[PDB]
C-alpha cells in the first residue's frame, strides 16, 4: 500500500568500526559504506576484520550501487575485496572514490574501477528508485560527506562519521542549510553517530590542536618522529605545514602515506614542495633539528614500525635521546598495554613522548552528547536510528533523543543482521540476516573463515598430542616401536618420562588389546582420546585434541 | 668498611603487581612482600604469575625471615607457594598472617604457618641485625602498614602501598609522628608508591564513595549486585553497612569472601549479625528490594561469574530488568573490553549499571604526585628509589622528587633483578640476578614454567600437521599407508584435498625415494620439514611445525 523500505545492517552494530548498511525497497537496493572492525591492536599489528557478505549474493538483481561516505580506510576496508565476489556501480565522492580505487588495486579488483561514479557535493544524484545528495560535514577526515535520501516512501539521513568543528584547518564549515532545508520539507529516517554518547561536553576543534604542534617544534632541539595511521590525513598535513614553517624536511615511511599524499596533492587539496620530502635513508645527512619522520605500516599497522624502532631493526632510524616523540595511533580501548610498552622502552632510550592531546581522551572525533542534540534539533526527524555504536552507546544516544521530545515509539536500537522495515508512519522488526566476519592477512591479502583460526585456539588450549602405532592385527598389539609426538604438552626434557610412562602404558594395552579394535582405526582413536582425556583431567584438568593412526604394514 | 647493605629485588619493576624485595646485608637477608602481578583479565578469569625463586635458594642460610606488609593478596600471592620449596619466619601482622595462613593451608604449606611471627604496630621487633617496626597508613585495605627498619648502616623505609586518605571508612589515621621522627634522626633508605605518578592532585578519599551508596541504595526498587575481588574488605564493608542501613540481606558469593568474612569478624575488626547474611540458593525467597549480592570468584576472578550470569548459567541467580548491578573489579588496563562485553550484554537483559566511581578512574588506590610530595617532604631522605611501577611511573615519580630538592645522584630506577649496594654515603650497581615469572592454573594450583606455554603458543603461530609413513627399508618407499594429521592447517572438509594434494606429492618421492634417508628416520624428518616450510611459504608464508614418524614394520 504505503511506500516503505526495508534497512537491515550488516556492519557496525556491536563494534567500533567494520560498519555497512543495505537498504532494501521495492525492486530498489543501495549499500551505504563497507568498513572494516578493530577490536585489538598489538606490538605488531591489528586485527583483521571484514563483514561477512552472504546476503549480497541473494538480491544482487536489486542493488543499484555502492554509496561511499568518506575518502577513510575505516570505511571503505572492504570495498576492494567485495568486489572479489560482486561487481555494482560505485557512486561516491571524487576523493572517496580516489583512495577506494586505489584499495581495490591493492586488492586486484579493477574491474569495480570502472563502476566509480563521481557524486557532485550539494549536487542531487538518481540512483534508480532514489536521489542521493553528499552533504560536506566537518570532521578529522579532510574530505567527508553525508547522505541525503529522497524517496517517494520520505527522505532518509546518513550522517555517520561527523564532529561539528566550528573552525576547521580547512576552514570549510559544514553546509547546515541543506540539513535544515530536508527538516524542514520532513525527514522520515535519520542515521545519525553514536560513538561518545557516554561523553558530555563538545569535543574540541581540531584547531585546539594547533598550539601543542607550534610550542612543541619551537622548544624542539632533536629530531621529530610521528606516528598514525595511513588515513590520519588532516592531522600529518597540520604536521607538516608547521615543519616547514620550522624548517623541518619530511621524511614519510609507509607507502600508503606516500600514494595518499600523490593522491590528495595530484588533487589540489593541498599544496606541497616535493623537494621538501625526504627518505629515511637520508636523516643521516641533516641535522636533527631540521628532521621530522612520518611513520605508519600497513592499514591499520602503527606501532609496528616504533616496537622495531625500540627494538633498533628499522635499519633506517636510530632513536636518540634528543628526540620527541609525538603518538597518535588509533585510539580503541584495549591498545593501552602497547602503547605503555613501547612507552618504558623508548624511556629506556630516554626519548621525550609527547600523547596526551591526540588520543581520544582529547579529541575522539566522534560527536558529543550536546552535539548529538543540536544535529537531532536540525532534523526534526520522524524515526531516529543510532549506528556505529556499540549497544551501549546507541542506548544512552537514544535516551538522548528521548531527551529532545522524540516520541519512544520512532528509536528503534539495532542488532547487526536485524531487518526493519520502515514505512510513513510505520517502523518494526521483522527477522534477522546472518551477519559475520571474516580475517584477512596483511601480508597475503585473502579472506578466511573465521572458523579455522576459533578451532585453532579452541584446541589451542590444552595440549597436542599424536601417536602412531604399527599394530598387526594378527597380535592386537604394537608390531613397529610407536611414534609420538606433542606441543604444548610438557616440557621435552620434563616430558620425555612423562608421555613415555602413559606410552608404556598404552604399548602394554596392545600387548593385550583387542585385535578388532586394533584392526580397526577407529576404535584406536577411540580408546587414545579415551586415555588422554583421563590422563589430561589427572594432570591439568583438561581433555586435549588426540591424533591417532594405525597401521597395518 | 662502612656499614653497608645490598637490595636487589625480585618483583614490582616492570608490571603493576607482583612486588617482591629481598634485602641482602653482610651475614643479614630479610624478604619484603611477595605479591602477584595480573599482566591481563578477561571473561573467565585472569593471568597467574608469581616471582621466580632462584635466588632464594642460593642463600638460604642468611635470610631471618618474611616480612608482608599487606593482609591483601596482590602482596603475599607467592608466600603460601613459595613454602612448597623453603621455609623461613614469617614476621607480620596478626591480620596479614591470617590471611597468609589461609592462603599456605590452600596451598597446603602448613608447615610455614608455624614461622607465623605477630609484629605489633608501632612497636620495634628485632629481627637478627635490623630492626623493624609497622607504622600504620591509611590505604584502601582494612589493615596495612609501613616497613621502618633501623640497622647500624642507618634507617630504610619501605610505604609501598599507601593513599593518605585524610577520612577513611575506619578513621584511624597514619601515625605520621613516627615517620616524621625517623625523617628527624636521619632516613637513609626510601621505598615509596609510584603507580599514579601521571596523575595530578590527590586521589578522592573513600568517603566519597559513600553518597553513592545511600543514594543509589536509596533509589533502588530491585535486586542489587555486587562484583569485585576477594581482598576489597573495605568496599564490601561499606556496602552492607548500607544495605543493613537499607535493610537488604547480604548473600556472599565465593568461598573467598565467606573467609575473609569470617575470619575479620572473628578478629573483631567489624561487627555483623550472622543472621543478616544469606545464600544465593533463597534469593528467590526474598523481596528483590531486600536482596543485595556480593560476588567474586577465584583469587583474583570477579567477571567470570559476571559473564555466567549474562549467559544465565549461575544456577543460582537470574538477572532481572529492575536489578541495579555496581561493578568494581580490578581496574588494570587492558580489560576495558571484557567490561563492555558484559556491560552490553548486561544491558540486553535491560539492566542498570553503575561503574563510574569504583575504577581506577576515581579512585585508584594510590597516591599520586602530590601526596608523594607529602611523603617526600614528611621524610627528607638521603637516598630514594621508587618502587612498585613500570619504568615510566618510577621515572614521572623521580621527576617529582627532583621537584622536591632531593639531589639526582642518590636516586635510582630499578629493572627486576638488579642488585644495588647502598652505603651511609655511598650508592652504585652491581649487577644483575635472574628474575622471572611462572604460571598457575587456578584449578590444579601448581607453579608451571613460562617454557611449555611459550613453546604451546609460539607454535600455535601456523599450523600443525604430523605424519606417519610405514615404509620397507628395501623399497625407500612406504609400503603401508600413512597416516596424517592436522590442526589449524586447513577446514577438514576443505583440507581433506590439499593436505592430501601435498600427501600424493610426499607418498610418490617414496616411490623413488632413498633407501638410507628412508630407513633413517632423522632425514626422514628433515625432508618432511623442508617439505612443510615450502607448502606453508607458498601458502600462508609460514613455517609450522611438522612431526614426522618412521616405522620399519
Given at each position: 500500500?504505503?511506500?516503505?523500505?526495508?534497512i537491515?545492517?550488516?556492519?557496525?552494530?556491536?563494534?567500533?568500526?567494520?560498519?555497512?548498511?543495505?537498504?532494501?525497497?521495492?525492486?530498489?537496493?543501495?549499500?551505504?559504506?563497507?568498513?572494516?572492525?578493530?577490536?585489538?591492536?598489538?606490538?605488531?599489528?591489528?586485527?583483521?576484520?571484514?563483514?561477512?557478505?552472504?546476503?549480497?549474493?541473494?538480491?544482487?538483481?536489486?542493488?543499484?550501487?555502492?554509496?561511499?561516505?568518506?575518502?577513510?580506510?575505516?570505511?571503505?576496508?572492504?570495498?576492494?575485496?567485495?568486489?572479489?565476489?560482486?561487481?555494482?556501480?560505485?557512486?561516491?565522492?571524487?576523493?572517496?572514490?580516489?583512495?577506494?580505487?586505489?584499495?581495490?588495486?591493492?586488492?586486484?579488483?579493477?574491474?569495480?574501477?570502472?563502476?566509480?561514479?563521481?557524486?557532485?557535493?550539494?549536487?542531487?544524484?538518481?540512483?534508480?528508485?532514489?536521489?542521493?545528495?553528499?552533504?560536506?560535514?566537518?570532521?578529522?577526515?579532510?574530505?567527508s560527506?553525508?547522505?541525503?535520501?529522497?524517496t517517494?516512501?520520505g527522505?532518509?539521513?546518513?550522517?555517520?562519521?561527523?564532529?561539528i568543528?566550528?573552525?576547521?584547518?580547512?576552514?570549510?564549515?559544514?553546509?547546515?542549510?541543506?540539513?535544515?532545508?530536508?527538516?524542514?520539507?520532513?525527514?522520515?529516517?535519520?542515521?545519525?553517530?553514536?560513538?561518545?554518547?557516554?561523553?558530555?561536553?563538545?569535543?574540541?576543534?581540531?584547531?585546539?590542536?594547533?598550539?601543542?604542534?607550534?610550542?612543541?617544534?619551537?622548544?624542539?632541539?632533536?629530531?621529530?618522529?610521528?606516528?598514525?595511521?595511513?588515513?590520519?590525513?588532516?592531522?600529518?598535513?597540520?604536521?607538516?605545514?608547521?615543519?616547514?614553517?620550522?624548517?623541518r624536511?619530511?621524511?614519510?615511511?609507509?607507502?600508503?602515506?606516500?600514494?595518499?599524499?600523490?593522491?590528495?596533492?595530484?588533487l589540489?587539496?593541498?599544496?606541497?614542495?616535493?623537494?621538501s620530502f625526504?627518505?629515511?635513508?637520508?636523516?643521516?645527512?641533516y641535522?636533527?633539528?631540521?628532521?621530522?619522520?612520518?611513520?605508519?605500516?600497513?592499514?591499520?599497522?602503527?606501532?609496528?614500525?616504533?616496537?622495531?624502532?625500540?627494538?633498533?631493526?628499522?635499519?633506517?632510524?636510530?632513536?636518540?635521546?634528543?628526540?620527541?616523540?609525538?603518538?597518535?595511533?588509533?585510539?580503541?580501548?584495549?591498545?593501552?598495554?602497547?602503547?605503555?610498552?613501547?612507552?618504558?622502552?623508548?624511556?629506556?632510550?630516554?626519548?621525550?613522548?609527547?600523547?596526551?592531546?591526540?588520543?581520544?581522551?582529547?579529541?575522539?572525533?566522534?560527536?558529543?552528547?550536546?552535539?548529538?542534540?543540536?544535529?537531532?534539533?536540525?532534523?526534526?526527524?520522524?524515526?531516529?536510528?543510532?549506528?556505529?555504536?556499540?549497544?551501549?552507546?546507541?542506548?544512552?544516544?537514544?535516551?538522548?533523543?528521548?531527551?529532545?521530545?522524540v516520541?519512544?515509539?520512532?528509536?528503534?536500537?539495532?542488532?547487526?543482521?536485524?531487518?526493519?522495515?520502515?514505512?510513513?508512519?510505520?517502523?518494526?522488526?521483522?527477522?534477522?540476516?546472518?551477519?559475520?566476519?571474516?580475517?584477512?592477512?596483511?601480508?597475503?591479502?585473502?579472506?578466511?573463515?573465521?572458523?579455522?583460526?576459533?578451532?585453532?585456539?579452541?584446541?589451542?588450549?590444552?595440549?597436542?598430542?599424536?601417536?602412531?602405532?604399527?599394530?598387526?592385527?594378527?597380535?592386537?598389539?604394537?608390531?613397529?616401536?610407536?611414534?609420538?609426538?606433542?606441543?604444548?604438552?610438557?616440557?621435552?626434557?620434563?616430558?620425555?618420562?612423562?608421555?613415555?610412562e602413559?606410552?608404556?602404558?598404552?604399548?602394554?594395552?596392545?600387548?593385550?588389546?583387542?585385535?578388532?579394535?586394533?584392526?580397526?582405526?577407529?576404535?584406536?582413536?577411540?580408546?587414545?582420546?579415551?586415555?588422554?582425556?583421563?590422563?589430561?583431567?589427572?594432570?591439568?584438568?583438561?581433555?586435549?585434541?588426540?591424533?591417532?593412526?594405525?597401521?597395518?604394514?
Amino acid at each position: 500500500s504505503k511506500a516503505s523500505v526495508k534497512i537491515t545492517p550488516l556492519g557496525g552494530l556491536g563494534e567500533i568500526g567494520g560498519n555497512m548498511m543495505v537498504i532494501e525497497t521495492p525492486k530498489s537496493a543501495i549499500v551505504i559504506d563497507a568498513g572494516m572492525s578493530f577490536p585489538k591492536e598489538g606490538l605488531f599489528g591489528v586485527d583483521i576484520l571484514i563483514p561477512d557478505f552472504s546476503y549480497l549474493h541473494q538480491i544482487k538483481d536489486k542493488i543499484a550501487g555502492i554509496i561511499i561516505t568518506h575518502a577513510h580506510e575505516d570505511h571503505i576496508g572492504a570495498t576492494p575485496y567485495l568486489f572479489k565476489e560482486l561487481q555494482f556501480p560505485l557512486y561516491g565522492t571524487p576523493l572517496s572514490l580516489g583512495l577506494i580505487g586505489s584499495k581495490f588495486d591493492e586488492h586486484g579488483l579493477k574491474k569495480y574501477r570502472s563502476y566509480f561514479k563521481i557524486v557532485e557535493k550539494r549536487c542531487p544524484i538518481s540512483v534508480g528508485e532514489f536521489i542521493i545528495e553528499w552533504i560536506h560535514i566537518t570532521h578529522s577526515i579532510i574530505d567527508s560527506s553525508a547522505l541525503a535520501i529522497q524517496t517517494k516512501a520520505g527522505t532518509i539521513i546518513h550522517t555517520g562519521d561527523f564532529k561539528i568543528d566550528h573552525t576547521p584547518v580547512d576552514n570549510l564549515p559544514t553546509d547546515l542549510y541543506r540539513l535544515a532545508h530536508y527538516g524542514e520539507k520532513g525527514v522520515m529516517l535519520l542515521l545519525s553517530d553514536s560513538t561518545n554518547s557516554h561523553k558530555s561536553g563538545t569535543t574540541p576543534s581540531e584547531s585546539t590542536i594547533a598550539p601543542a604542534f607550534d610550542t612543541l617544534f619551537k622548544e624542539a632541539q632533536g629530531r621529530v618522529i610521528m606516528s598514525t595511521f595511513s588515513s590520519n590525513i588532516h592531522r600529518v598535513y597540520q604536521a607538516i605545514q608547521y615543519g616547514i614553517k620550522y624548517n623541518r624536511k619530511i621524511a614519510v615511511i609507509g607507502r600508503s602515506m606516500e600514494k595518499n599524499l600523490d593522491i590528495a596533492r595530484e588533487l589540489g587539496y593541498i599544496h606541497l614542495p616535493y623537494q621538501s620530502f625526504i627518505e629515511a635513508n637520508e636523516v643521516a645527512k641533516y641535522p636533527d633539528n631540521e628532521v621530522l619522520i612520518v611513520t605508519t605500516g600497513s592499514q591499520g599497522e602503527t606501532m609496528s614500525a616504533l616496537y622495531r624502532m625500540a627494538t633498533d631493526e628499522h635499519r633506517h632510524i636510530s632513536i636518540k635521546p634528543n628526540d620527541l616523540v609525538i603518538i597518535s595511533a588509533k585510539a580503541i580501548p584495549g591498545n593501552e598495554a602497547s602503547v605503555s610498552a613501547v612507552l618504558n622502552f623508548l624511556i629506556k632510550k630516554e626519548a621525550k613522548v609527547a600523547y596526551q592531546e591526540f588520543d581520544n581522551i582529547h579529541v575522539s572525533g566522534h560527536a558529543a552528547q550536546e552535539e548529538q542534540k543540536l544535529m537531532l534539533r536540525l532534523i526534526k526527524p520522524k524515526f531516529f536510528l543510532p549506528v556505529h555504536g556499540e549497544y551501549n552507546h546507541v542506548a544512552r544516544h537514544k535516551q538522548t533523543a528521548i531527551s529532545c521530545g522524540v516520541p519512544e515509539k520512532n528509536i528503534y536500537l539495532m542488532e547487526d543482521g536485524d531487518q526493519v522495515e520502515v514505512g510513513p508512519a510505520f517502523i518494526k522488526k521483522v527477522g534477522t540476516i546472518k551477519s559475520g566476519k571474516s580475517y584477512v592477512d596483511n601480508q597475503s591479502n585473502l579472506s578466511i573463515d573465521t572458523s579455522i583460526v576459533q578451532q585453532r585456539e579452541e584446541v589451542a588450549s590444552a595440549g597436542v598430542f599424536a601417536a602412531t602405532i604399527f599394530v598387526n592385527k594378527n597380535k592386537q598389539a604394537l608390531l613397529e616401536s610407536s611414534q609420538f609426538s606433542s606441543l604444548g604438552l610438557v616440557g621435552f626434557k620434563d616430558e620425555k618420562p612423562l608421555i613415555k610412562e602413559i606410552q608404556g602404558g598404552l604399548e602394554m594395552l596392545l600387548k593385550s588389546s583387542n585385535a578388532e579394535i586394533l584392526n580397526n582405526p577407529k576404535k584406536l582413536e577411540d580408546h587414545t582420546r579415551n586415555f588422554i582425556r583421563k590422563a589430561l583431567f589427572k594432570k591439568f584438568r583438561k581433555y586435549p585434541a588426540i591424533i591417532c593412526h594405525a597401521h597395518s604394514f
